[PDB]
Amino acid sequence: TVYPDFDIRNINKLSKKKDIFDILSQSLAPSIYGHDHIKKAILLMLMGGVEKNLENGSHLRGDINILMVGDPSTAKSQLLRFVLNTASLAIAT
Amino acid sequence: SVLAAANPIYGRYDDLKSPGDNIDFQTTILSRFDMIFIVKDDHNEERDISIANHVINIHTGNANAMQNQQEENGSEISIEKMKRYITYCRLKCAPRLSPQAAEKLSSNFVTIRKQLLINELITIRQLEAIIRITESLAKLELSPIAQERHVDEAIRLFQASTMDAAGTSLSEIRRFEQELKRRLPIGWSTSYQTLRREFVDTHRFSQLALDKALYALEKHETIQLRHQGQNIYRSGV
């Protein structure tokens, strides 16, 4: 043979606050100081959009592609390693 | 431990061009190395005499005779004795970072980083490279606690390789750069001894600010040092 309620209540309780967007953004990379605008983009990227599917068959994308261009070793090499351990499915290439 | 030796594509290190153009490497290669030294073959008459006096004495059979006079005085260590001293320190000495030296390394890192930011108007791996050099200095004397004496020695070796490849003190530097940009046209061929008798004897600037301002303007392709740095020639704006 080959084999390939407590958590739900705590989610809806924290969602009632109006500051859940800044708290969850700073909790992704606590060791990386600053860069609050860059951490907010990784949050919406991991959640993903809505896969819009028409009736004729033409599907639309929903993923968010982020490109970082800057000086080497500026919260870029270490930032990519945190996303590989946070997401449930990630391939380091 | 990577110990490579590269060579320029033009045969010689052109001082008139940018350091990034003479080196045929990427930006991710210079950031991985800890120390990048530049061996400039300067044509000096006083230096070629001492160099020629050492190669001749070696080939004249005096290399074996000088070994008995240097080893008896305690100034040179043989190869067999140095082989057992490196392995002994790599297995019994485990240096760390003392709290008194951590504040000096963190404060001096911002000072060197702020100097390059003004000239542009240093990565995270460059900070960890100084820690490895400081920890290696304590392993020589078999000291598990790195004191503040090993920090100043690692900074001196870092500024002579990394920086050499790229209140009242900061006020005199900006005033000296603005004065040379107006008192010397674009292409002025003024000797080094001429400008030294106009800013030091007039009780306005010090000798430390003269050599520091001339070196910073050379990296921007603006001041070209000719004749072993004896004649200052302006190029860029």
A73 touching B, CB under 8 A? Answer: yes
This structure's resolution (Å) is 6.1
Answer yes or no: do B125 and A71 touch at CB < 8 A.
Answer: no
> How many residue pairs from chains A and B have C-beta atoms closer than 8 A?
12
Return the exposure string of A48-81: e unless at least 16 CB atoms fall within 10 Å of the residue's CB, then b: eeeeeeeeeeeeeeeeeeeeeeeeebebeeebee
Give the closest residue to A45 by CA, choosing from A62, A69, A32: A62
Chain A residue numbers touching B123 (CB-CB < 8 A): 71-74
Give the closest residue to B3 by CA, choosing from B31, B37, B27, B28: B37
End-to-end CA distance of chain B: 42
- From the number of C-beta atoms within 10 Å of its C-beta (0-12, 13-18, 19+), residue B130 rates as buried
Tokens, residue A92? 């380091």
Shortest distance, CA A76 to any CA of chain B (angstroms): 11
A31 touching B, CB under 8 A? Answer: no
User: What residues of B are in the A interface, CB distance below 8 Å?
Assistant: 27-28, 31, 123-125
Helical (H) or strand (E) element with B191: strand B189-191
Method: cryo-EM
Helical (H) or strand (E) element with A13: helix A6-14
**Cα dihedral: B27, B33, B35, B40 (round 10):** -50
A10 touching B, CB under 8 A? Answer: no
For the beta sheet containing B189-191, the strands, ordered from the edge strand earlier in sequence to the opposite edge, are B189-191, B231-234, B223-226
Tokens, residue B136? 């290696």
Chain B residue numbers touching A33 (CB-CB < 8 A): none
Alpha-helical regions (H) of chain B: 19-22, 27-30, 45-57, 63-71, 79-92, 99-120, 124-140, 149-159, 168-183, 192-199, 207-218
Answer yes or no: do B27 and A73 touch at CB < 8 A.
Answer: no
A34 touching B, CB under 8 A? Answer: no
* Chain A residue with minimum CA distance to B123: A73
Query: How many angstroms separate the most distant Cα atoms in chain B?
Result: 62
Tokens, residue B7? 């060579």
Answer yes or no: do B124 and A71 touch at CB < 8 A.
Answer: no
Q: Which amino acid, A36?
A: D
Give the closest residue to A47 by CA, choosing from A8, A1, A7, A83: A83
How far is residue B70 from each of residues B50, B64, B122, measured CA to CA in Å?
19, 10, 42
